């Protein structure tokens, strides 16, 4: 079973932790990758009720299982905070335009 289901993509907690670790490391070093400059601030326009405090940052999580290193980010993202705590996993899949819905 999937710990996180983003549309048709299946992720385990380990997939989320691996992606998060990479994203946090780049955040800490002040570097970015990709045309959208990941990781970058997640404003939470959606108003999701995360249990951890902001600021939030988003980083792509890939269905291939690899860590994002550039190129197309896909529709899924892991969201973490300044304390390297996981806020949640979200996706553009099933959401209109550039909005996000949570993966369940
Ligand atoms: N939907 C959404 N987009 C966000 C949020 N925070 C930042 N963004 C960025 O705001 C712009 C419009 O949605 C995009 O550049 C988007 O970046 P990403 O496309 O990388 O998510 C957020 O809380 N929700
Ligand atoms: Sr996996």
Check: CB of residue 32 under 8 Å from CB of residue 63.
no
- Ligand at minimal distance from the CA of 44 is 1
Our answer on whether the CB atom of 46 is closer than 6 Å to any ligand 1 atom is yes
Method by which the coordinates were obtained: X-ray
Q: In angstroms, rounded to a whole number, what is the distance separating the alpha carbons of residues 62 and 78?
A: 10
Distance 41 CA to ligand 1 centre (A): 8
List, in order of start, the domains of the chain with CATH numbers. Answer: 1-104 (3.10.450.30)
SS3 label, residue 25: helix
Q: Which helix (H) or strand (E) holds 21?
A: helix 13-29
Q: In angstroms, rounded to a whole number, what is the distance separating the alpha carbons of residues 16 and 89?
A: 8
Helix, strand, coil shares, percent, the chain, to 5: 15, 30, 55
How long a stretch of residues is the chain?
104
Give the residue numbers annotated as catalytic, written as ranges: 40, 58, 92
Resolution in angstroms, to 1 decimal, for this deposition? 1.7
Nearest CA to ligand 1 atom 12: 98
Terminal CA-CA length for the chain:
12
Q: In angstroms, rounded to a whole number, what is the distance separating the alpha carbons of residues 35 and 46?
A: 23
Check: CB of residue 69 under 8 Å from CB of residue 33.
yes
Q: Which of 55, 54, 51, 60 is nearest to 90 (CA)?
A: 60
- Here the tokens at position 95 are 């959401």
Ligand 1 pocket test: pick from 36, 45, 75 the residue with the most ligand atoms within 8 Å of its Cβ: 45
Q: Which of 100, 29, 93 is nearest to 58 (CA)?
A: 100
């Amino acid at each position: 079973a999937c710990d996180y289901t983003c549309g048709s993509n299946c992720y385990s907690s380990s997939d989320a932790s691996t992606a998060q670790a990479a994203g946090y490391k780049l955040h800490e070093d002040g570097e970015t990758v990709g045309s959208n400059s990941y990781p970058h601030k997640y404003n939470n326009y959606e108003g999701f009720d995360f249990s951890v405090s902001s600021p939030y940052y988003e980083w792509p999580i890939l269905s291939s299982g690899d860590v994002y290193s550039g190129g197309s980010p896909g529709a899924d993202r892991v969201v973490f905070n300044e304390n390297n705590q996981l806020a949640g996993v979200i996706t553009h899949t099933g959401a209109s335009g550039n909005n996000f819905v949570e993966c369940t």
